[PDB]
């Protein structure tokens, strides 16, 4: 118990430490990108220990370590959830991010703002691990909006370009359309189950869950670029190749899929929500893979590839296989 | 509350006896000392308000507005000392005296135990604000803006005077502490309908209500920077404060008097936000965004649930800091390009990177990025309005699209793109300006660590 | 209103029964505000004649303060007297007319039914 | 900038239309 | 911009480092109070109902 | 540019005439949606209140409001 | 004093603070008389608050 | 022609006469001391000591107390078999209903 | 620590480590490294800090509010009594809020602790949660933002009139 929770919080605090280093600076750096790459590699190594001792016993816990705010019946706490989804996704995300940053030390070498770029990429990683480890909907919304804003700042990296700013504002627009449904779901759970924590949502086990699941499906449509709210992910290729490689292929865009996987005890008892996810995912994975057949920009083709795979993930959530969908994320 | 009134009055001999190079430094120093002293008002209790005397009291609603009011004066002195550098010395002291007088009127507006003294201070705040707009505003339309700011407010407030004197003659008192215990239910009659309108329409104008907001995109625009800071950050919030004091007496008629006005805000925050998509004037965009944000506070006060009042007072404090910082950013560009047209100076992140970081932070707080208290107030209002009626999330969520879409457009048009070629007087960011941006943004970010102090009397 | 009271003893600024009242203190905050009005009149009198405002004619400023405190002291005495006469007439009229001012039977809230209006 | 270069009311006479077109820096046939 | 950030961090740390050192020395050496039942006939002061010494000092000095 | 901003901002009311077109567009776009959302939210809250005071709405864990 | 102008606002606090304390003694009608906080006075105690 | 008017004065640059200017005043000593006053009494005093004061508020609005007090009452009524909370806030013996 | 009666945990049954393979797992070696490198120096530092605590022992107290008369036995428009009734009612309302929070923490901790069989093994916490939410809803719901003991008494009297009418029609 004392090993697991300690190294769990060490991973997150260790990822936050180069943000304090880049904000508390005076000098021109002795290779700050190597520092952030070494930091994320060691955070991967540190996060492998709770993963392995999850593989040994299935050991899950919840670190509700800081009481934040009690709104009369809603005790909001800094509450981290170390279950199967965190224990598998956090090493995969850290490993991919370590590869993207050692790639970025080569690719972004001519950029005179490389420290700002590594700062932003690490801020994305911090907000994504706030998203995937959260226990209440407020903290998951913090990570949700955080990866959205780092998506904005990293699409619109070369900000003298009109199309980069246009693509970034487009990504913000579609993700706020998803945020309509996310805040719908938060409103439903607060008014009907008196909670944002996942535990009380799972334990009360509501039956009339059509409207909060429609809100979660709208949030996943915005975040995982499903049909109707898809084109921001092909527009998002206007950012640099480490941004499209880390965020908009593998790590950010699975957060809506991860949101619907995270609510699997509610989607497993709602056939209408499963049919909506199934039809929406099949529509998206048809449409984007059909669009990819005739494109000529290589990053557009791989962006339609990753949106077709997200549509496949939404399909396999829709057939009541959330763990195969999460396995397909990690794969 | 006399331990804050007397230092604010001693700011008058402090500014009228200072040396001619010293009247900004001394007033800034001692107004920061008054703002440090303001934290003693956080002696709040879970049941009893901090009741000082027969005349003054402070609950957990008035206390954050008092701290924000006493904090806003040094920031206004920093914002306003550049464009009044060539000003005459005695007119400079008159400007500082009007700001000091406005702080004095506000800090005993929020702590007025009795409601007609609340009214006298509430309408006493017009005169320094009117004089600041019409005397130190820059353009021709400051006079018309002063006329609109005066005459929407008085046409709203004089029926409030009649209604408060009626409550005095009927209930026997206008002590709020007495009226917590002697409040009688207000039944359905036409007499009580106009009682409700006379008690509410003054604060509806001061919030502003959509449809009555027309004074604001002149009064916030034609004012100087200290005028825009105090109008956006404090003087709109007198309406919400007075509504939260006056809707105690207006039950249960409010439960069917609120229906038009709720519509006027729930559609109006869609309209004014949409108006911010097509504003060419940056300062007018910030004004219409202030109307858009205060419409949620109007809805949250009219639906009168605990989550709604908590989100409304959080959103009032958060919008005070955010809109004050946005006007200071707009002034920091106006002091360079001498035009409030937003399309004129573009690409400013290439020229001013740290100031563009401040633009980014104030934009993110404008679009309610969690866990900022902008998002806390926004979110609690959305929760309470969903519990009010489930359909309202549409008008909430659509609002949260457009609120993003003008906040980053303001970030993209001013800071991103190619810089303007023919503009070459873009000086580097002064230390006073970055100090001003940090003294707005750093309390707004530190309040996310302990938001319970800005969540009103029923946290 | 009270014009029939001060009609048997007319044009009396402070009657003899006013000497039954506690006079205002010299540290009365109303009297200190009237002295501040005298000081403001002294400063405006220096300003309109283009004198140095705080320095010129301290004898004149001090006579302004003295004259306003002197007039305002008697004005506060008469103010306290007229409110004392107001309350004396009120209490004597309530005492002489009990049939118009009955003691209301105060019911505790266990009997007092109030209609609950739900906010939802 | 001054008064006669600001936008004004709708032109009805052809000389007012020509003065408006000269104000907006464009041809009368294109205005 | 560098001069502003240097002066900003300087004047924050100028009192932040003594405040952090002081809070650490209060928590270590002075230490936090302990919950106890009230003795019979003992009337506590209003600052004796709080756990941290800085909160007790604030409730005794100012509130 | 100054001419464009003055036409977009200050020239609008001195070149306005109240006629048939502007009155129908101001009634259609100004009070129309207010009437629409009024009847929508009013019908919704009447239905919800009628369900609540008849003991029909599932309000089992709803204690935050 | 060469910097007598820097005591106008602080003493104006302290004097104001003084008056608030002087105000509280004029609002002491229910000192140790409330139904919630009334008690017997301790030895060498004459008032329960000031 | 038009009247006797002073022309539009040019905008001053504070960096020309003082490249070390903090933008407070054109006198460099007044400028640097205004900088020090703003930075000390704003950041070193109000922000740092203010956040320290707010961080150690003595149980702001008695929430922590109300936790601990609740931990008394539940422990009193888990032990004595009582329900955790009554649906009636006040005793139904001390309430008179209007008869019908 | 806390009271195990107000915050209940059942006894923990961990199984004995029964290795089948001959490969030594890294978890035991890392647990020994966490004991040597981490747990013992933190233990020594906390022992030092606790000795510095024990050099100056002092106490704080839990405030006891004696019961004043409630709103039912206050005369109407008598502020000196109904003030005390209202303050007592606000403190009772805040304590009932914290009671509901304690039962929510019990329910969520039971759900995480029982894991996959939580729907079977947390029926008691769910039932206590349902009872205390029902009681809190009957006591304080829909009072408004301007709630009082008068509003709460009026809601209770309306509920008692409805219950008396429902009892009379069922007889
Ligand atoms: C106090 C309040 C009243 C002061 C009136 C006189 C003010 C004055 O002359 O100031 C100049 C004088 C300095 O001037 P100077 O250098 O000697 O010579 C004149 C200049 O050359 C001036 O240069 P100039 O005149 O050549 O040109 C500049 C021009 C600049 O003017 C312009 O350009 C035009 C105006 C600009 C726009 C308008 C700005 C605002 C001005 C009006 C205020 C409106 C708001 C007021 C409240 C709202 C209601 C309307 O005019 C002035 O500056 C004229 C001077 C007056 C300025 C201040 C006006 C105050 C009077 C009005 C407000 C107070 C009364 C009404 C209050 C209502 C209820 C609250 O200022 C002071 O000395 C201020 C006082 C500081 C010391 C205070 C000490 C207190 C001691 C207390 C203890 C002792 C007494 C104990 C009493 C109790 C005994 C029991
Ligand atoms: C150091 C410099 C820091 C920076 C300085 C400058 C800072 C800037 C200016 C700030 C100005 C003040 C502002 C206002 C704040 C005032 C302080 C306050 O309110 O404190 C509140 C709060 C409560 O303080 P309290 O009420 O005074 O104490 C309550 C206790 O009941 C009573 O306390 P206690 O008696 O129980 O505890 C005593 C404690 C004294 O307490 C303190 O020092 C706490 C006060 C410090 C507060 C600092 C706040 C400033 C911000 C710091 C964080 C940011 C820094 C920069 C960025 C870093 C990277 C993030 O003693 C110690 O610390 C000594 C133990 C050391 C253990 C570690 C080493 C053990 C092994 C050693 C082996 C070698 C020797 C062997 C032989 C030995 C022989 C003897 O204190 C803190 O929050 C402390 C900060 C650390 C919190 C936990 C950190 C880890 C959390 C991880 C999970 C959560 C995050 C997950 C993130 C996920 C991704 C995003
Ligand atoms: C009580 C003790 C508290 C201690 C902890 C502090 C708590 C928060 C306080 C305020 C923190 C912000 C202050 C620094 C940033 C503002 C100035 C700036 O941009 O400087 C850049 C500069 C470094 O850049 P550079 O290369 O030198 O030049 C800048 C370039 O020109 C251009 O630069 P650029 O554009 O490339 O980079 C700008 C970049 C822009 O970055 C972004 O836009 C990304 C951020 C947004 C998306 C990601 C985050 C989403 C939310 C999640 C995080 C919060 C929750 C996390 C916890 C787990 C989940 C619950 O900014 C950052 O990355 C800043 C990192 C921290 C961001 C915090 C959130 C701000 C976002 C908007 C509001 C979000 C909701 C409220 C959150 C409040 C949390 C308390 O920073 C400094 O030099 C630091 C100056 C000194 C900072 C003092 C901080 C404390 C102030 C309070 C004093 C009194 C209390 C004592 C505390 C003392 C602590 C040492
Ligand atoms: C390197 C510098 C670090 C510090 C160096 C010096 C100390 C060295 C380390 C030794 C440990 C020091 C003592 C232990 C620390 C204090 C322990 C303690 O009990 O502290 C009191 C408490 C713990 O909680 P608590 O329950 O005791 O009190 C909370 C206060 N009430 C009850 C009023 C609500 O506070 C902290 O520990 C504060 C720090 C928390 C850490 C995480 C902060 C995240 C901030 C995010 C902002 C936005 C969040 C919004 C969303 C939230 C989720 C929904
Ligand atoms: C910003 C511009 C718009 C501002 C709107 C301001 C509010 C709109 C409504 C105000 C009505 C007038 C004040 C009402 C005060 C009510 C006090 C009271 O006790 O009422 C009950 C009393 C009842 O009388 P009573 O209480 O003495 O009688 C005893 C009780 N009964 C009736 C049962 C016997 O109402 C009245 O006497 C009349 C109230 C209506 C007054 C109608 C005239 C004014 C019409 C509206 C004018 C609006 C502003 C005009 C200017 C616009 C800009 C130029
Ligand atoms: C207030 C109304 C008016 C509004 C404007 C006010 C302006 C005037 C300003 C006056 C002074 C300031 C007043 C407000 C102060 C608010 C701050 C405050 O007091 O906080 C108290 C809070 C109180 O938290 P707490 O409630 O848990 O404290 C526990 C209580 N005690 C200490 C008694 C046991 O302090 C903290 O939280 C300190 C914790 C340590 C410091 C923070 C560490 C984490 C923060 C984020 C770090 C980075 C994480 C990763 C991010 C990665 C990049 C994005
Ligand atoms: C333009 C800028 C933006 C707008 C700013 C605000 C200006 C308007 C402010 C007032 C808004 C309207 C008044 C509030 C309506 C609340 C509900 C109501 O009263 O409905 C009207 C009434 C409903 O009928 P009923 O409820 O039966 O009335 C009998 C009461 N004993 O209906 C009727 O009885 C029929 C109509 C009768 C005439 C009413 C006229 C007075 C009210 C409007 C002034
Ligand atoms: C300055 C005030 C100087 C007053 C000097 C004395 C004058 C005097 O003796 O006046 C008598 C008068 C009271 O006489 P009385 O019969 O009550 O008046 C009825 C009026 N309807 O006294 C008064 O009326 C006193 C009030 C007069 C105030 C006038 C200026 C304001
Ligand atoms: C109605 C109508 O047709 O009004 C037209 C009339 C002018 O008629 P005209 O077209 O000039 O002949 O125009 C008028 O008589 C003046 C305007 C008539 C009333 C319009 C009411 C609604 C205005 C918009 C409200 C937005 C909120």
In short:
Chain C is an all-alpha fold.
Task: Quickly list its features.
part of a larger assembly; 9 chains; E: 63 residues; F: mainly alpha; elongated; binds 1,2-diacyl-SN-glycero-3-phosphocholine; binds 1,2-Distearoyl-sn-glycerophosphoethanolamine; electron transport; respiration; proton pump; mitochondria
Describe what this molecule looks like in 3D.
The structure is cut from a larger assembly and holds 9 protein chains of 9 kinds. With 459 residues, chain B is mostly helical. Chain B is built from 20 helices and 2 strands. Chain B has one domain. Chain B has helices spanning 2-16, 23-37, 62-80, 89-107, 115-124, 126-136, 142-171, 176-179, 190-206, 216-222, 225-235, 237-246, 254-266, 268-275, 282-303, 306-337, 353-366, 373-388, 392-415, 431-446, and strands spanning 50-51, 57-58. A two-stranded antiparallel sheet of chain B has the order 1-2. The longest helix of chain B is centred in the last third of the chain and has 32 residues, at 306-337. The radius of gyration of chain B is 21 Å and the shape is globular. In chain C, α1 (29-48) runs antiparallel to α2. Chain C has 120 residues and is an all-alpha fold. Chain C has one domain (1-97). Chain B binds chain H through residues 21-22, 24-25, 28-29, 32-33, 35-36, 39, 42, 44-47, 60, 71, 74, 78, 81-82, 85-86, 338, 425, 427-428, 430-433, 435, 438-439, 442-443, 446, 449-450, 452-453, 459, and chain H through 9, 11-15, 21-27, 30, 33-35, 37-39, 41-43, 45-47, 49-51, 53-55, 57, 60-63, 65-66. β1 (34-36) of chain E pairs parallel with β1 (59-61) of chain I, so a sheet runs across the interface. One cardiolipin sits between chains B (353-354, 357, 360-361, 364-365, 369, 371-372, 442, 445-446, 448-449) and A (19, 23, 78, 116, 123, 127, 130, 139, 142, 146, 149-150, 153). One 1,2-Distearoyl-sn-glycerophosphoethanolamine binds next to α9 and α13 of chain B. It is classed as electron transport.
């Amino acid at each position: 118990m004392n090993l697991f929770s300690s190294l769990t919080l060490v991973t997150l605090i260790l990822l936050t430490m180069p943000i304090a280093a880049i904000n508390f600076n005076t000098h021109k750096f002795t290779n700050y990108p190597l520092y952030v790459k070494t930091t994320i590699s060691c955070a991967f190594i540190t996060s492998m220990i709770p993963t392995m001792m999850f593989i040994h016993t299935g050991q899950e816990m919840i670190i509700s370590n800081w009481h934040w705010l009690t709104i009369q019946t809603l005790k909001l706490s800094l509450s981290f959830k170390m279950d199967f989804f965190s224990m598998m996704f956090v090493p995969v995300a850290l490993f991919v991010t370590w590869s993207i940053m050692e790639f970025s030390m080569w690719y972004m070498h001519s950029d005179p703002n490389i420290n700002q770029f590594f700062k932003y990429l690490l801020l994305f990683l911090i907000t994504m691990l706030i998203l995937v480890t959260a226990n209440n909907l407020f903290q998951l919304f913090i990570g949700w909006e955080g990866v959205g804003i780092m998506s904005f700042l990293l699409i619109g990296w070369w900000y003298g370009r009109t199309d980069a700013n246009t693509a970034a504002l487009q990504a913000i627009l579609y993700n706020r359309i998803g945020d309509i449904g996310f805040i719908l779901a938060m409103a439903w759970f607060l008014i009907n189950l008196n909670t944002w924590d996942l535990q009380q949502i799972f334990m009360l086990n509501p039956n009339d869950s059509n409207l909060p699941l429609m809100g979660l499906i709208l949030a996943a449509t915005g975040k995982s670029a499903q049909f109707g709210l898809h084109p921001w992910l092909p527009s998002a290729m206007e950012g640099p190749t480490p941004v499209s490689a880390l965020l908009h292929s593998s790590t950010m865009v699975v957060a809506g899929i991860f949101l619907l996987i995270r609510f699997y005890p509610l989607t497993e008892n709602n056939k209408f929500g499963q049919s909506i996810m199934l039809c929406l995912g099949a529509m998206t994975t048809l449409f984007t893979a059909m669009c990819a057949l005739t494109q000529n920009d290589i990053k557009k083709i791989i962006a339609f590839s990753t949106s077709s795979q997200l549509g496949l993930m939404m399909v396999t959530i829709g057939i009541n296989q959330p763990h195969l969908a999460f396995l397909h994320i990690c794969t | 509350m006399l331990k804050y009134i007397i230092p604010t009055m001693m700011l008058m001999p402090l500014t009228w006896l200072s040396k001619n190079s010293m009247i900004w430094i001394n007033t800034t120093l001692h107004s920061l000392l008054i703002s440090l002293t303001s934290l003693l008002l956080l002696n709040q209790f879970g049941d009893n308000s901090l009741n000082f005397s027969l005349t003054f009291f402070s609950d957990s609603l008035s206390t954050p507005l008092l701290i924000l009011t006493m904090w806003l004066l040094p920031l206004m002195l920093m914002a306003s000392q550049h464009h009044l550098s060539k000003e005459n010395l005695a007119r400079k002291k008159l400007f500082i005296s009007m700001l000091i007088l406005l702080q004095l009127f506000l800090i005993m507006t929020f702590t007025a135990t009795e409601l007609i003294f609340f009214y006298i201070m509430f309408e006493a705040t017009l005169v320094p604000t009117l004089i600041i707009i019409t005397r130190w505003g820059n353009q021709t339309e400051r006079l018309n803006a002063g006329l609109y700011f005066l005459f929407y407010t008085l046409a709203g407030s004089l029926p409030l005077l009649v209604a408060l004197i009626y409550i005095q003659n009927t209930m026997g008192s206008l002590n709020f502490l007495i009226l917590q215990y002697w409040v009688q239910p207000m039944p359905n009659s036409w007499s009580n309908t106009f009682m409700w309108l006379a008690c509410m329409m003054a604060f509806m104008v001061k919030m502003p209500l959509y449809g009555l907001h027309l004074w604001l995109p002149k009064a916030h625009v034609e004012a100087p920077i200290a005028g825009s800071m105090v109008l956006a950050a404090i003087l709109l919030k007198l309406g919400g404060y007075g509504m939260m004091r006056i809707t105690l007496l207006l039950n249960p008629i409010t439960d069917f008097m609120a229906y038009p006005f709720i519509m006027l805000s729930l559609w109006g925050m869609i309209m004014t936000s949409s108006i911010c998509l097509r504003q060419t004037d940056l300062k007018s965009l910030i004004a219409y965004s202030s109307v858009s944000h205060m419409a949620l506070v109007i809805v949250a006060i009219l639906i009168q649930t605990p989550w709604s009042y908590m989100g409304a007072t959080a959103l009032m404090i958060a919008h005070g800091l955010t809109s004050s910082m946005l006007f200071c950013l707009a002034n920091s560009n106006y002091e360079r390009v001498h035009s409030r047209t937003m399309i004129l100076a573009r690409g400013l992140q290439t020229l001013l990177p740290l100031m563009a970081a401040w633009w980014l932070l104030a934009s993110l707080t404008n679009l309610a990025l969690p866990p900022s208290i902008n998002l806390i107030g926004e979110l609690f209002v959305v929760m309470s309005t969903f519990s009010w009626s489930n359909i309202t999330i549409i008008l909430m969520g659509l609002n949260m699209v457009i609120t993003a879409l003008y906040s980053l457009y303001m970030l993209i048009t001013t800071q991103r793109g190619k810089h303007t070629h023919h503009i070459n007087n873009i000086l580097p960011s002064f230390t006073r300006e970055n100090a001003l941006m940090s003294l707005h943004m750093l309390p707004l970010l530190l309040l996310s660590l302990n938001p319970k102090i800005i969540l009103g009397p029923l946290y | 209103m009270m014009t029939g009271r001060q009609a048997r003893a007319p044009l009396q600024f402070l009657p003899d029964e006013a000497r039954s009242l506690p006079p205002p203190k010299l540290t009365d905050p109303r009297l200190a505000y009237i002295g501040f009005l005298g000081y403001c009149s002294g400063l405006i009198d220096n300003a309109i004649r283009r004198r140095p405002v705080l320095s010129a004619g301290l004898h004149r400023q001090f006579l302004y303060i003295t004259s306003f405190v002197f007039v305002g002291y008697y004005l506060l005495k008469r103010q306290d007297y007229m409110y004392a006469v107001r309350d004396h007439d009120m209490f004597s009229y309530i005492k002489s007319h009990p049939e118009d001012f009955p003691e209301k039977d105060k019911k505790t809230y266990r009997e007092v039914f109030e209609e609950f209006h739900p906010v939802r | 900038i001054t008064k006669d270069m600001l936008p004004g009311p709708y032109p009805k006479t052809p000389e007012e239309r020509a003065a408006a077109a000269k104000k907006y820096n464009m041809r009368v046939e294109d205005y | 911009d560098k001069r502003f950030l240097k002066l900003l961090r300087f004047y924050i740390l100028l009192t932040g480092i003594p405040v952090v050192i002081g809070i650490t020395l209060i928590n270590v050496f002075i230490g936090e109070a302990e919950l106890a039942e009230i003795p019979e006939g003992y009337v506590p002061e209003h600052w004796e109902y709080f756990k941290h010494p800085i909160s007790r000092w604030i409730a005794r000095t100012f509130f | 540019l100054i001419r464009w901003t003055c036409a977009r901002s200050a020239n609008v009311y001195p070149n306005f005439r109240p006629n048939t077109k502007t009155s129908l567009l101001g009634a259609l776009f100004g009070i129309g949606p207010l009437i629409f959302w009024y009847y929508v939210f009013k019908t919704d809250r009447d239905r919800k209140e009628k369900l609540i005071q008849e003991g029909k709405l599932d309000r089992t864990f709803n204690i935050s409001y | 004093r060469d910097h007598w102008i820097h005591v106008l606002v602080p003493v104006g606090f302290v004097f104001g603070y003084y008056l608030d304390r002087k105000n509280d003694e004029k609002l002491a009608a229910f000192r140790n008389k409330s139904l919630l906080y009334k008690r017997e006075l301790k030895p060498q105690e004459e008032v329960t608050w000031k | 022609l038009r009247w006797q008017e002073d022309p539009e004065p040019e905008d001053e640059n504070l960096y020309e006469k003082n490249p070390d200017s903090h933008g407070y005043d054109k006198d460099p000593a007044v400028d640097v001391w205004n900088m020090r006053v703003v930075f000390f009494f704003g950041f070193s005093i109000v922000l740092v000591l203010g956040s320290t004061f707010v961080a150690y508020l003595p149980d702001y609005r008695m929430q922590e107390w109300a936790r601990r007090e609740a931990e008394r009452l539940v422990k009193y009524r888990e032990a004595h078999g009582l329900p955790l909370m009554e649906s009636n806030c006040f005793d139904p013996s001390k309430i008179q209903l209007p008869e019908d | 620590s806390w009271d195990k009666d107000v915050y209940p945990e059942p006894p923990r049954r961990t199984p004995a480590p029964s290795p089948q393979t001959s490969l030594p797992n890294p978890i035991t070696y890392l647990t020994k490294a966490f004991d040597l490198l981490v747990d013992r120096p933190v233990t020594l530092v906390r022992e030092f800090i606790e000795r510095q605590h024990a050099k100056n022992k002092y106490y704080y107290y839990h405030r006891e509010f004696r019961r004043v008369p409630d709103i039912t036995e206050c005369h109407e428009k008598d502020v000196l009594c109904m003030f005390e009734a209202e303050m007592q009612w606000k403190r009772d309302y805040k304590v009932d809020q914290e009671i509901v929070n304690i039962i929510q923490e019990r329910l969520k901790a039971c759900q995480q602790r029982e894991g996959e069989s939580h729907r079977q093994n947390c029926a008691k916490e769910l039932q206590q949660f349902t009872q205390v939410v029902k009681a809190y809803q009957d006591r304080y719901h829909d009072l408004g933002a301007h709630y009082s003991a008068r509003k709460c008494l009026a809601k209770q009297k309306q509920r008692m009139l409805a219950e008396r009418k429902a009892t009379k029609e069922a007889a």
